[PDB]
């Protein structure tokens, strides 16, 4: 059906955003973890 | 020209292998780091 050029494109953005969020998670979660050692040094 | 279907494909494998190696690095480097807390020769 559409498993062609138009399809391979969607993947490119899929992986793209997937690699962005992945870092944003460890970055955002690091804020909640700071509570223990609230950045005051 | 070349910046088309055939091009977007190459990217898919680029990111693919790039995400594999990335993990293989932190995995392989972990062996060298063990020296401190691991059997030394």
CATH code of the domain covering residue A37: 1.20.5.2440
For chain A, the residues whose C-beta falls within 8 A of a C-beta of chain B are 4-5, 8-9, 11-12, 15-16, 19
Candidates A2, A8, A33, A14; CA nearest to B19 is: A14
Helix, strand, coil in percent for chain B, rounding step 5:
80, 0, 20
**Domain span at B28:** 1-41
d(CA B34, CA B32): 5
- Residue of chain B whose Cα is closest to the Cα of A4: B5
d(CA A26, CA A14): 19
- Rounded to the nearest 10°, the torsion over CA A11, B20, B8, A2 is -30
Structural domains of chain A, count: 1
From B40's Cα to the closest Cα of chain A, the distance in A is 33
What phi-psi label fits residue B40: left (phi over 0), alpha (psi between -120 and 50 degrees) or beta?
Answer: beta
Exp. method: NMR
Give kind and range of the element (H or E) at residue B3.
none
Q: Which of chain B's residues have a Cβ under 8 Å away from the Cβ of A20? A: none
């Amino acid at each position: 059906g559409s498993l062609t050029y138009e399809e391979v494109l969607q993947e490119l953005v899929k992986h793209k955003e997937l690699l962005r969020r992945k870092d944003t998670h460890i970055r955002e979660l690091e804020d909640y973890i700071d509570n223990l050692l609230v950045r005051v040094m």
